[PDB]
């Protein structure tokens, strides 16, 4: 299901066989040419379309390319060497800037930015003033 | 007509098939060359690279160093070269050490450190012996004329 | 699918000035640190592609690929736990007839897919599952 | 590996999930604020420190402050 | 109906002063108004970018075309007041007489503040400022004898002046031509290539022929420019014409039949240069215009318009396609007929690339008369136009990149040319790279390598003519060839289109003008730096082009922008990583490439080729022959050249060229002011300007446009600014200062 | 069968060309000798040819232009180690041709190994392959009239255009 492209000198390298990879996936209604992080254009497939990059940012730099194609149902993938998979994006199906109710805080401060203990304080202690 | 494609049909690897990468002329030249032979021991594959790189390295001392113009000048020159061999083989000697390690099982493949050890033996012992043979040479040179 | 394969790394957080593994591991389990090519007819990173003929471009052979199929599992097994969340929700605020929570899964994801499903309010759940 | 964290005064404007190039951040359901959201950073390992999140805060004073730390391969945005 | 047709708008923008009163009119966020003191520094950064003011191209083109008249209309009131100047304070008429002894004078300063001294003793009763742009050598040649001419050129260039100007609002304000008008590249070409260009050179012609050419006769024969007759005599009088060339007796009648060789008597092929004055031969000049004048008119009928016969650009493209390129050149036209940047960045390179051609072609081949005796004229020149092409070759450049960040579509480029550039980029800079490092290693290792030899006492040992020796074979044998090509390959010829390549010294008034120039060791040396200078600077340049868009560090770099101060301190630091950056560094590595040339130019010049003949054969060269041993080494140009050239400028005070002694060091100054821009940073300003502003509010007052640091972007920009200006003036001082006395 | 296969060679003025029918019973392997010596033939004679014109027309800018014009009196006045350095350097190239004419799928003449990218089914392959054949054919008549001008008429140079 690969997109039709030409080849490039853009490509992964070594990471991708050896520490990790990445893939993205999604659905097109009609052959049309975006451009693709690496250089260079290719024609998406009318249907599904698989593509592998070296680094999460350009996977989610396609996709937002693919919004303006009016194209939604993309989902991202980490591949590691051995051959285990995590899906990464959209993590819980929906969108990050979509609040959804079941999803936890994390790495927050009940306070105001001001409010931080000083670096004195903590001397000798290990952590840090905005980890305290 | 295209010449150039992607590499091994991978259209996402970040290589190309051309002339130049992938010609009969290239794969072939590579396929017996020492580094990438098949059937040669680890000691083999290096005493040839250094019985080639030995022999071409004299010239540069001998014809242009400090004391080209002496009568002792293709003796130094021969010196010189040894020289930098010994600095090549300290630099492959930790190349190894840091690349694989101490201790090593699988055995001949030119990338463990036994193997990496026996290649740089002959290494040295090819380039040292490469260059003596280019000092006997250019001691008296033909001019092939009858 | 061993969800926490990433988070078991070498990787060890240290004692500020760090995020921490995160959700999804900080690093690779593996190891790039591997050697460089090697003769015809030897392999060098472990389970390495064969380059054939062409050792020089071995590391261009690609080994590490996603099924399809592979694929839709783990889209399955790391959103577990929000469908279970989700169908949760839907079972609290009485449902029609309700029977299962896994049954009521089952029916819900029939229909409207799964990706949907995950994507719906309890309220457009209980107005689908009215029937 | 970077550390990101949350303030109070956040205001739910999803701004800076919604410039984050690499998905660290997420809007979570709250009630400090009037619009009843607040912001989280789940995935700090994926974090780049580009700082473009703080650009987008609206706030007097950043509710959302990136503080750059241990590098890995990640964080250093290597592709190689 | 006709596929060229012209198409106007009547009354398309109302003519009124409401506008101005409004700054910031042409920009949507700038109209709105002045909160902090970053909207005046946008205001004047944002001006001329009509892409981002409109969204129409007809609207962009529209005011493109205007504004040119604009242009126009002030490079006519420049010449104007130059003739004028060389009329109301000048000294060519005394000059025009002995063009030997007196010495070129076009501006005069006024007798305030001790500011006279300034005013030298040119020559011919006259006290003014030495002009060395050349104007009195080009008038001499034109033929202008008199001063009430130069004035009536004078007023010709004035009312020029004001016609472009009533041009650009007429076509503005009133006939706004559409956009189809514009895209109408082959008429435009055949027009362009045989009006402007035919016409312009076989006018020209005519103007040498019957006006120049004789009256350039009788000048050098002798003739008192006052009994000289009028211009227009000539032209009416064919017999005084026939006395000077006895061909004009046959009339026109030669040409219309095909005898166009009894026209040899004015139309030669002589080569070489006129002894007496040291300059082209005009017959041979004009030759060149009415030869250049077919060829041109010819050309300007390749293109079809309106009847079917010619050529289509569209086609020719699409055809040039082979097995290692894809579609080819397929989609370029629409490019290049559709956006304005991309235009630019083609024309603007050949632009530069000519001005840097005319300045080595303009020195040995020296043009007009009595200008290579005139040393401090000749260089100007030089390095004038050496600098003009420096930037804007580097200019087409940042336009090109302007375009594949604004312009380019990846839907109207698959597989062509440009994709497949696009595709290989990596292996492109990666060789790039290498090229650059193997040619600087070795090209200035030999410097070094000599220096350290001759500094341990280790002559022997060096790179040079009288040791280890890299002679320039190849181009030694490429001046052989152009020696003996007179008489062999270019049989009709009669001397060497330059005495550079080889022939014997032609001397004029005592002093040197062209000398076969030989190339040795050290000329090997300084050819290959040039090479090693220009290559890092296509390096940086074509990097910001090919990178513009995406990089692997940052894959959305185009969403960011041209002109991006960064994209954050992450990825490990992503500072200076725009295309504009690029341009930025680019810019600095132009001012070295140049500056070596000029120096070349410069020392070679004083060395080897000007200077004073005896009668009998026994050459002087200005520097004395030193640049051979002196400049294989480091040392030998610090002191051999700057150190002893520099005498001059140091020892102005007290002289009417104090000036280039106190411009010498404002330069300085100014160079070493921008060091604090380059170096510094916003932030910290920001936060001094904080104090500052405290003690304003202390005592009750503060500005509303809130003062605030200048972005990174402009302090980039303010510091290549003032580096620039510094390092180009503290050597035009350098050298005029210089040049006067060697003259 | 070569001859119900071959599509290069075969051109306009005369089709399939075999007179004497010197391919009639030959086998594939005999054939492609054939084929692999006319283009070798044939390419040396081009290269050859280039070289004359060059000595002749007396651009030869090397030794100081000390050698003559003639081409076959320079290689009399050439030093043993430049012919000895020749022959060693091309029986090199020969070897490593041989390496490439063992590998499964050679095509006879191909040492570029463009097999890899085109066949013959493109016409714009097979008709450039047919330049450089008729190229090369007409190059080795050329190489061995000039030799005879030069040695028996007694001329090294063009003597047919050369009278504008
Ligand atoms: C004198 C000051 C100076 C020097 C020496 C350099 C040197 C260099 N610059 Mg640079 N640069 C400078 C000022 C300088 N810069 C300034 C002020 C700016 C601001 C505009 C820049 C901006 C700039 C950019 C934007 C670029 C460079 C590039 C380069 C490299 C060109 C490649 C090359 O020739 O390698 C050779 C380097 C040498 C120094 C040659 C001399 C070294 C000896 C003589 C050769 C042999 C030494 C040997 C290798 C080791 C000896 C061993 C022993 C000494 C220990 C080189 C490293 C380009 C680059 O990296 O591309 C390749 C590039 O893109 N420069
Ligand atoms: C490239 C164009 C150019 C340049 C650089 C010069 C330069 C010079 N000319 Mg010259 N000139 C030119 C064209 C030019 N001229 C033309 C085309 C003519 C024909 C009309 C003349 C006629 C001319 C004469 C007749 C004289 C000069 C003189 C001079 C010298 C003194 C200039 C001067 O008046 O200082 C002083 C400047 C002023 C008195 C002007 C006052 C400053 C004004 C008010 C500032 C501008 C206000 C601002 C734009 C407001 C904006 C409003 C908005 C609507 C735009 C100076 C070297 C003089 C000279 O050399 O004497 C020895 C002299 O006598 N020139
Ligand atoms: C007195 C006559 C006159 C008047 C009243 C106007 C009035 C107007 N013009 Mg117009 N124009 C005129 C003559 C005039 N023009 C001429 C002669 C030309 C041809 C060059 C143009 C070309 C032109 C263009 C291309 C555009 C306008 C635009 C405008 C409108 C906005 C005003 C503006 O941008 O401020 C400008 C005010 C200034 C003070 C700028 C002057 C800058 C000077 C000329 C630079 C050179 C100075 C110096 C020599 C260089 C440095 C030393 C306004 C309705 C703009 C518009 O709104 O279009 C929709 C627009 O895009 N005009
Ligand atoms: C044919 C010539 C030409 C033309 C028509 C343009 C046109 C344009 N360029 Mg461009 N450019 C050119 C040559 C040209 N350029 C060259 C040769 C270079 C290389 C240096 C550049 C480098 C360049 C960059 C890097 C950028 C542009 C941009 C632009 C666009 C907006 C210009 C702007 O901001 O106006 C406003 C103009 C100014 C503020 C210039 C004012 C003059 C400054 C202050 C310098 C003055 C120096 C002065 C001579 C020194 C006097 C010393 C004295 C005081 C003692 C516009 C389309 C910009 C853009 O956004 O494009 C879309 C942009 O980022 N160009
Ligand atoms: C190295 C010499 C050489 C060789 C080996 C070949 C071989 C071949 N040619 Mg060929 N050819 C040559 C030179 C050669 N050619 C020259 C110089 C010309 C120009 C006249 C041609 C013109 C030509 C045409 C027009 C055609 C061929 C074809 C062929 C192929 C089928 C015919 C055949 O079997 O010929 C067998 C030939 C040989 C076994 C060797 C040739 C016999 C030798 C040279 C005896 C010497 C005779 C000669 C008179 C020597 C004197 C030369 C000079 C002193 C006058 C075959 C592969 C045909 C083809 O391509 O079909 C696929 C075809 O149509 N050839
Ligand atoms: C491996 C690198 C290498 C090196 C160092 C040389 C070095 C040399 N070649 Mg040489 N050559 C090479 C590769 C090389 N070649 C290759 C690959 C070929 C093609 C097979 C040739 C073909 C060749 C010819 C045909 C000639 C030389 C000649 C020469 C000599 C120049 C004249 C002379 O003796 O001045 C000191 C010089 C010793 C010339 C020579 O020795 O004539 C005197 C000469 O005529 N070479
Ligand atoms: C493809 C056709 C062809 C070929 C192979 C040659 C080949 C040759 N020509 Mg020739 N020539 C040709 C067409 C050709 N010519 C035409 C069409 C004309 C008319 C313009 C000439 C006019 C011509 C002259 C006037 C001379 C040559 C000479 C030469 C010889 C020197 C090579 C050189 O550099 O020439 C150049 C060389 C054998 C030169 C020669 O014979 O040197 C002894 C020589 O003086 N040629
Ligand atoms: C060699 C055996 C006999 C040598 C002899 O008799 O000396 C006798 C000769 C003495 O030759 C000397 O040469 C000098 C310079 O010209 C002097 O001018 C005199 O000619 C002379 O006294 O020794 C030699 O020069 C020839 C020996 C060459 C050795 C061949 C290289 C072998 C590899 C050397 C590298 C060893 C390092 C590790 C090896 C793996
Ligand atoms: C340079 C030799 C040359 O011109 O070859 C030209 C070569 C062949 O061009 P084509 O004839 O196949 O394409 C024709 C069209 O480009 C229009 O001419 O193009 C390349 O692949 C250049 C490769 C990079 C250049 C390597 C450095
Ligand atoms: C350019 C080119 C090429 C290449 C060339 C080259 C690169 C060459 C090189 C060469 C070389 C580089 C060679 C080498 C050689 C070496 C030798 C020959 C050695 C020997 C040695 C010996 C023989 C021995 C020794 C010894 C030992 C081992 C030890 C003990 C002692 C003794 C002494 C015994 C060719 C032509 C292909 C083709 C074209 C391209
Ligand atoms: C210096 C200057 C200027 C200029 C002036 C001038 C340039 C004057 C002149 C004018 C003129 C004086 C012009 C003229 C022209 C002429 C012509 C252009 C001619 C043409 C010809 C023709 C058109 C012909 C045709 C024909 C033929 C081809 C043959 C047959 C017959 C007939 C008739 C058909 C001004 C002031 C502006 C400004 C300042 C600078």
Same mark, same amino acid.
């Given at each position: 299901?690969?997109?039709?492209?030409?080849?490039?000198?853009?490509?992964?390298?070594?990471?991708?066989?050896?520490?990790?990879?990445?893939?993205?996936?999604?659905?097109?209604?009609?052959?049309?040419?975006?451009?693709?992080?690496?250089?260079?254009?290719?024609?998406?497939?009318?249907?599904?379309?698989?593509?592998?990059?070296?680094?999460?940012?350009?996977?989610?730099?396609?996709?937002?390319?693919?919004?303006?194609?009016?194209?939604?149902?993309?989902?991202?993938?980490?591949?590691?060497?051995?051959?285990?998979?995590?899906?990464?994006?959209?993590?819980?199906?929906?969108?990050?800037?979509?609040?959804?109710?079941?999803?936890?805080?994390?790495?927050?401060?009940?306070?105001?930015?001001?409010?931080?203990?000083?670096?004195?304080?903590?001397?000798?202690?290990?952590?840090?003033?905005?980890?305290? | 007509?295209?010449?150039?494609?992607?590499?091994?049909?991978?259209?996402?690897?970040?290589?190309?098939?051309?002339?130049?990468?992938?010609?009969?002329?290239?794969?072939?030249?590579?396929?017996?060359?020492?580094?990438?032979?098949?059937?040669?021991?680890?000691?083999?594959?290096?005493?040839?690279?250094?019985?080639?790189?030995?022999?071409?390295?004299?010239?540069?001392?001998?014809?242009?160093?400090?004391?080209?113009?002496?009568?002792?000048?293709?003796?130094?020159?021969?010196?010189?070269?040894?020289?930098?061999?010994?600095?090549?083989?300290?630099?492959?000697?930790?190349?190894?050490?840091?690349?694989?390690?101490?201790?090593?099982?699988?055995?001949?493949?030119?990338?463990?450190?036994?193997?990496?050890?026996?290649?740089?033996?002959?290494?040295?012992?090819?380039?040292?012996?490469?260059?003596?043979?280019?000092?006997?040479?250019?001691?008296?040179?033909?001019?092939?004329?009858? | 699918?061993?969800?926490?394969?990433?988070?078991?790394?070498?990787?060890?957080?240290?004692?500020?000035?760090?995020?921490?593994?995160?959700?999804?591991?900080?690093?690779?389990?593996?190891?790039?640190?591997?050697?460089?090519?090697?003769?015809?007819?030897?392999?060098?990173?472990?389970?390495?592609?064969?380059?054939?003929?062409?050792?020089?471009?071995?590391?261009?052979?690609?080994?590490?690929?996603?099924?399809?199929?592979?694929?839709?599992?783990?889209?399955?097994?790391?959103?577990?736990?929000?469908?279970?969340?989700?169908?949760?929700?839907?079972?609290?605020?009485?449902?029609?007839?309700?029977?299962?929570?896994?049954?009521?899964?089952?029916?819900?994801?029939?229909?409207?897919?799964?990706?949907?499903?995950?994507?719906?309010?309890?309220?457009?759940?209980?107005?689908?599952?009215?029937? | 590996?970077?550390?990101?964290?949350?303030?109070?005064?956040?205001?739910?404007?999803?701004?800076?999930?919604?410039?984050?190039?690499?998905?660290?951040?997420?809007?979570?359901?709250?009630?400090?604020?009037?619009?009843?959201?607040?912001?989280?950073?789940?995935?700090?390992?994926?974090?780049?420190?580009?700082?473009?999140?703080?650009?987008?805060?609206?706030?007097?004073?950043?509710?959302?402050?990136?503080?750059?730390?241990?590098?890995?391969?990640?964080?250093?945005?290597?592709?190689? | 109906?006709?596929?060229?047709?012209?198409?106007?708008?009547?009354?398309?923008?109302?003519?009124?002063?409401?506008?101005?009163?409004?700054?910031?009119?042409?920009?949507?966020?700038?109209?709105?108004?002045?909160?902090?003191?970053?909207?005046?520094?946008?205001?004047?950064?944002?001006?001329?970018?009509?892409?981002?003011?409109?969204?129409?191209?007809?609207?962009? #083109?529209?005011?493109?075309?205007?504004?040119?008249?604009?242009?126009?209309?002030?490079?006519?009131?420049?010449?104007?007041?130059?003739?004028?100047?060389?009329?109301?304070?000048?000294?060519?008429?005394?000059?025009?007489?002995?063009?030997?002894?007196?010495?070129?004078?076009?501006?005069?300063?006024?007798?305030?503040?001790?500011?006279?001294?300034?005013?030298?003793?040119?020559?011919?009763?006259?006290?003014?400022?030495?002009?060395?742009?050349?104007?009195?050598?080009?008038?001499?040649?034109?033929?202008?004898?008199?001063?009430?001419?130069?004035?009536?050129?004078?007023?010709?260039?004035?009312?020029?002046?004001?016609?472009?100007?009533?041009?650009?609002?007429?076509?503005?304000?009133?006939?706004?031509?559409?956009?189809?008008?514009?895209?109408?590249?082959?008429?435009?070409?055949?027009?362009?290539?045989?009006?402007?260009?035919?016409?312009?050179?076989?006018?020209?012609?005519?103007?040498?022929?019957?006006?120049?050419?004789?009256?350039?006769?009788?000048?050098?024969?002798?003739?008192?420019?006052?009994?000289?007759?009028?211009?227009?005599?000539?032209?009416?009088?064919?017999?005084?014409?026939?006395?000077?060339?006895?061909?004009?007796?046959?009339?026109?009648?030669?040409?219309?039949?095909?005898?166009?060789?009894?026209?040899?008597?004015?139309?030669?092929?002589?080569?070489?240069?006129?002894?007496?004055?040291?300059?082209?031969?005009?017959?041979?000049?004009?030759?060149?215009?009415?030869?250049?004048?077919?060829?041109?008119?010819?050309?300007?009928?390749?293109?079809?318009?309106?009847?079917?016969?010619?050529?289509?650009?569209?086609?020719?493209?699409?055809?040039?396609?082979?097995?290692?390129?894809?579609?080819?050149?397929?989609?370029?036209?629409?490019?290049?007929?559709?956006?304005?940047?991309?235009?630019?960045?083609?024309?603007?390179?050949?632009?530069?690339?000519?001005?840097?051609?005319?300045?080595?072609?303009?020195?040995?081949?020296?043009?007009?008369?009595?200008?290579?005796?005139?040393?401090?004229?000749?260089?100007?020149?030089?390095?004038?136009?050496?600098?003009?092409?420096?930037?804007?070759?580097?200019?087409?450049?940042?336009?090109?990149?302007?375009?594949?960040?604004?312009?380019?579509?990846?839907?109207?480029?698959?597989?062509?040319?440009? *994709?497949?550039?696009?595709?290989?980029?990596?292996?492109?800079?990666?060789?790039?790279?290498?090229?650059?490092?193997?040619?600087?290693?070795?090209?200035?290792?030999?410097?070094?390598?000599?220096?350290?030899?001759?500094?341990?006492?280790?002559?022997? *040992?060096?790179?040079?003519?009288?040791?280890?020796?890299?002679?320039?074979?190849?181009?030694?044998?490429?001046?052989?060839?152009?020696?003996?090509?007179?008489?062999?390959?270019?049989?009709?010829?009669?001397?060497?289109?330059?005495?550079?390549?080889?022939?014997?010294?032609?001397?004029?008034?005592?002093?040197?003008?062209?000398?076969?120039?030989?190339?040795?060791?050290?000329?090997?040396?300084?050819?290959?730096?040039?090479?090693?200078?220009?290559?890092?600077?296509?390096?940086?340049?074509?990097?910001?082009?090919?990178?513009?868009?995406?990089?692997?560090?940052?894959?959305?770099?185009?969403?960011?922008?041209?002109?991006?101060?960064?994209?954050?301190?992450?990825?490990?630091?992503?500072?200076?990583?725009?295309?504009?950056?690029?341009?930025?560094?680019?810019?600095?590595?132009?001012?070295? #490439?140049?500056?070596?040339?000029?120096?070349?130019?410069?020392?070679?010049?004083?060395?080897?080729?000007?200077?004073?003949?005896?009668?009998?054969?026994?050459?002087?060269?200005?520097?004395?022959?030193?640049?051979?041993?002196?400049?294989?080494?480091?040392?030998?140009?610090?002191?051999?050249?700057?150190?002893?050239?520099?005498?001059?400028?140091?020892?102005?005070?007290?002289?009417?060229?104090?000036?280039?002694?106190?411009?010498?060091?404002?330069?300085?100054?100014?160079?070493?002011? #921008?060091?604090?821009?380059?170096?510094?940073?916003?932030?910290?300003?920001?936060?001094?300007?904080?104090?500052?502003?405290?003690?304003?509010?202390?005592?009750?007052?503060?500005?509303?446009?809130?003062?605030?640091?200048?972005?990174?972007?402009?302090?980039?920009?303010?510091?290549?600014?003032?580096?620039?200006?510094?390092?180009?003036?503290?050597?035009?001082?350098?050298?005029?200062?210089?040049?006067?006395?060697?003259? | 069968?070569?001859?119900?296969?071959?599509?290069?060679?075969?051109?306009?003025?005369?089709?399939?060309?075999?007179?004497?029918?010197?391919?009639?019973?030959?086998?594939?392997?005999?054939?492609?000798?054939?084929?692999?010596?006319?283009?070798?033939?044939?390419?040396?004679?081009?290269?050859?040819?280039?070289?004359?014109?060059?000595?002749?027309?007396?651009?030869?800018?090397?030794?100081?232009?000390?050698?003559?014009?003639?081409?076959?009196?320079?290689?009399?006045?050439?030093?043993?180690?430049?012919?000895?350095?020749?022959?060693?350097?091309?029986?090199?190239?020969?070897?490593?041709?041989?390496?490439?004419?063992?590998?499964?799928?050679?095509?006879?003449?191909?040492?570029?190994?463009?097999?890899?990218?085109?066949?013959?089914?493109?016409?714009?392959?097979?008709?450039?392959?047919?330049?450089?054949?008729?190229?090369?054919?007409?190059?080795?008549?050329?190489?061995?009239?000039?030799?005879?001008?030069?040695?028996?008429?007694?001329?090294?140079?063009?003597?047919?255009?050369?009278?504008?």
């Amino acid at each position: 299901p690969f997109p039709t492209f030409g080849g490039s000198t853009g490509g992964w390298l070594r990471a991708a066989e050896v520490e990790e990879k990445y893939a993205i996936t999604w659905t097109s209604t009609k052959e049309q040419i975006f451009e693709m992080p690496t250089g260079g254009a290719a024609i998406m497939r009318n249907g599904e379309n698989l593509l592998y990059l070296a680094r999460k940012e350009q996977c989610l730099a396609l996709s937002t390319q693919l919004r303006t194609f009016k194209i939604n149902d993309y989902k991202i993938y980490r591949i590691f060497p051995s051959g285990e998979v995590q899906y990464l994006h959209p993590k819980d199906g929906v969108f990050p800037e979509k609040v959804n109710p079941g999803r936890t805080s994390v790495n927050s401060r009940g306070f105001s930015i001001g409010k931080n203990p000083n670096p004195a304080s903590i001397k000798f202690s290990g952590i840090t003033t905005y980890e305290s | 007509a295209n010449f150039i494609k992607p590499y091994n049909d991978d259209p996402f690897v970040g290589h190309l098939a051309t002339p130049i990468t992938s010609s009969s002329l290239t794969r072939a030249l590579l396929k017996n060359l020492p580094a990438y032979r098949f059937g040669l021991t680890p000691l083999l594959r290096g005493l040839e690279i250094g019985l080639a790189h030995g022999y071409f390295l004299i010239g540069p001392f001998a014809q242009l160093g400090p004391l080209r113009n002496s009568d002792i000048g293709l003796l130094a020159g021969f010196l010189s070269t040894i020289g930098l061999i010994l600095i090549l083989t300290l630099g492959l000697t930790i190349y190894g050490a840091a690349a694989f390690g101490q201790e090593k099982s699988n055995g001949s493949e030119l990338q463990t450190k036994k193997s990496w050890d026996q290649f740089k033996g002959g290494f040295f012992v090819g380039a040292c012996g490469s260059a003596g043979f280019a000092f006997i040479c250019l001691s008296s040179i033909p001019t092939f004329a009858l | 699918v061993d969800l926490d394969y990433g988070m078991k790394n070498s990787y060890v957080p240290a004692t500020g000035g760090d995020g921490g593994q995160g959700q999804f591991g900080a690093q690779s389990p593996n190891d790039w640190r591997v050697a460089g090519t090697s003769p015809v007819g030897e392999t060098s990173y472990a389970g390495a592609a064969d380059g054939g003929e062409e050792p020089w471009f071995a590391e261009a052979i690609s080994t590490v690929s996603l099924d399809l199929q592979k694929a839709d599992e783990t889209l399955k097994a790391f959103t577990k736990d929000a469908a279970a969340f989700k169908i949760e929700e839907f079972a609290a605020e009485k449902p029609y007839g309700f029977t299962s929570s896994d049954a009521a899964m089952e029916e819900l994801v029939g229909k409207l897919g799964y990706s949907k499903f995950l994507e719906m309010s309890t309220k457009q759940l209980m107005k689908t599952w009215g029937t | 590996s970077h550390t990101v964290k949350i303030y109070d005064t956040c205001i739910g404007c999803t701004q800076c999930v919604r410039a984050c190039p690499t998905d660290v951040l997420e809007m979570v359901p709250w009630d400090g604020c009037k619009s009843g959201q607040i912001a989280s950073s789940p995935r700090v390992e994926d974090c780049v420190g580009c700082k473009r999140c703080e650009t987008a805060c609206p706030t007097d004073f950043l509710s959302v402050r990136v503080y750059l730390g241990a590098e890995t391969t990640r964080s250093l945005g290597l592709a190689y | 109906s006709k596929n060229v047709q012209v198409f106007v708008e009547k009354d398309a923008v109302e003519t009124s002063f409401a506008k101005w009163a409004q700054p910031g009119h042409f920009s949507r966020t700038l109209a709105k108004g002045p909160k902090t003191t970053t909207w005046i520094w946008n205001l004047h950064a944002d001006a001329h970018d009509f892409d981002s003011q409109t969204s129409s191209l007809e609207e962009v #083109s529209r005011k493109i075309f205007s504004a040119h008249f604009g242009q126009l209309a002030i490079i006519f009131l420049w010449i104007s007041g130059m003739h004028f100047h060389g009329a109301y304070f000048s000294n060519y008429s005394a000059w025009l007489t002995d063009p030997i002894s007196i010495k070129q004078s076009s501006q005069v300063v006024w007798p305030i503040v001790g500011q006279e001294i300034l005013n030298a003793d040119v020559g011919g009763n006259f006290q003014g400022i030495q002009t060395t742009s050349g104007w009195f050598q080009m008038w001499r040649a034109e033929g202008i004898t008199s001063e009430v001419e130069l004035y009536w050129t004078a007023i010709g260039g004035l009312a020029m002046s004001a016609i472009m100007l009533f041009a650009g609002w007429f076509h503005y304000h009133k006939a706004a031509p559409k956009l189809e008008w514009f895209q109408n590249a082959e008429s435009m070409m055949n027009h362009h290539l045989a009006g402007l260009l035919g016409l312009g050179c076989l006018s020209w012609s005519g103007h040498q022929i019957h006006i120049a050419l004789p009256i350039n006769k009788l000048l050098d024969a002798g003739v008192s420019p006052q009994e000289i007759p009028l211009p227009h005599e000539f032209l009416i009088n064919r017999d005084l014409m026939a006395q000077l060339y006895p061909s004009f007796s046959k009339g026109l009648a030669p040409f219309f039949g095909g005898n166009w060789g009894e026209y040899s008597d004015f139309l030669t092929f002589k080569g070489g240069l006129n002894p007496v004055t040291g300059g082209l031969w005009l017959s041979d000049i004009a030759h060149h215009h009415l030869a250049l004048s077919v060829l041109f008119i010819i050309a300007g009928h390749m293109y079809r318009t309106n009847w079917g016969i010619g050529h289509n650009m569209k086609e020719i493209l699409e055809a040039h396609k082979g097995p290692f390129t894809g579609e080819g050149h397929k989609g370029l036209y629409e490019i290049l007929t559709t956006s304005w940047h991309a235009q630019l960045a083609i024309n603007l390179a050949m632009m530069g690339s000519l001005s840097i051609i005319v300045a080595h072609h303009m020195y040995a081949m020296p043009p007009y008369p009595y200008l290579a005796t005139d040393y401090a004229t000749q260089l100007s020149l030089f390095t004038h136009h050496m600098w003009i092409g420096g930037f804007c070759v580097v200019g087409g450049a940042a336009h090109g990149a302007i375009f594949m960040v604004r312009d380019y579509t990846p839907a109207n480029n698959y597989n062509n040319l440009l *994709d497949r550039v696009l595709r290989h980029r990596d292996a492109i800079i990666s060789h790039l790279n290498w090229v650059c490092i193997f040619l600087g290693c070795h090209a200035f290792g030999f410097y070094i390598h000599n220096d350290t030899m001759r500094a341990l006492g280790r002559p022997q *040992d060096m790179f040079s003519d009288k040791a280890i020796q890299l002679q320039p074979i190849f181009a030694q044998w490429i001046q052989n060839i152009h020696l003996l090509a007179p008489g062999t390959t270019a049989p009709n010829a009669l001397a060497t289109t330059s005495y550079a390549f080889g022939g014997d010294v032609i001397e004029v008034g005592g002093k040197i003008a062209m000398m076969p120039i030989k190339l040795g060791t050290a000329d090997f040396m300084v050819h290959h730096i040039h090479a090693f200078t220009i290559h890092v600077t296509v390096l940086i340049l074509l990097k910001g082009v090919l990178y513009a868009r995406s990089s692997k560090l940052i894959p959305d770099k185009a969403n960011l922008g041209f002109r991006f101060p960064c994209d954050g301190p992450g990825r490990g630091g992503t500072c200076q990583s725009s295309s504009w950056d690029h341009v930025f560094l680019g810019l600095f590595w132009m001012y070295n #490439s140049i500056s070596v040339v000029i120096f070349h130019f410069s020392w070679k010049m004083q060395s080897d080729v000007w200077g004073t003949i005896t009668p009998d054969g026994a050459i002087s060269h200005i520097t004395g022959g030193n640049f051979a041993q002196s400049s294989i080494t480091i040392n030998g140009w610090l002191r051999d050249f700057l150190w002893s050239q520099a005498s001059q400028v140091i020892q102005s005070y007290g002289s009417a060229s104090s000036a280039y002694g106190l411009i010498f060091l404002g330069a300085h100054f100014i160079w070493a002011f #921008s060091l604090m821009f380059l170096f510094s940073g916003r932030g910290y300003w920001q936060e001094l300007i904080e104090s500052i502003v405290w003690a304003h509010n202390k005592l009750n007052f503060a500005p509303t446009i809130q003062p605030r640091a200048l972005s990174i972007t402009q302090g980039r920009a303010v510091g290549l600014a003032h580096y620039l200006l510094g390092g180009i003036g503290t050597t035009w001082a350098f050298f005029l200062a210089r040049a006067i006395s060697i003259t | 069968a070569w001859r119900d296969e071959v599509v290069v060679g075969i051109t306009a003025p005369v089709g399939f060309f075999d007179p004497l029918g010197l391919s009639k019973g030959k086998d594939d392997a005999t054939m492609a000798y054939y084929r692999e010596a006319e283009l070798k033939n044939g390419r040396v004679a081009m290269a050859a040819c280039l070289g004359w014109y060059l000595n002749a027309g007396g651009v030869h800018p090397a030794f100081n232009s000390e050698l003559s014009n003639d081409p076959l009196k320079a290689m009399v006045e050439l030093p043993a180690v430049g012919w000895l350095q020749f022959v060693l350097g091309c029986g090199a190239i020969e070897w490593l041709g041989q390496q490439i004419k063992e590998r499964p799928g050679y095509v006879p003449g191909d040492l570029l190994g463009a097999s890899y990218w085109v066949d013959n089914s493109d016409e714009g392959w097979v008709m450039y392959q047919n330049k450089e054949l008729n190229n090369g054919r007409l190059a080795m008549l050329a190489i061995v009239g000039m030799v005879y001008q030069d040695v028996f008429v007694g001329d090294y140079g063009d003597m047919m255009y050369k009278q504008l």
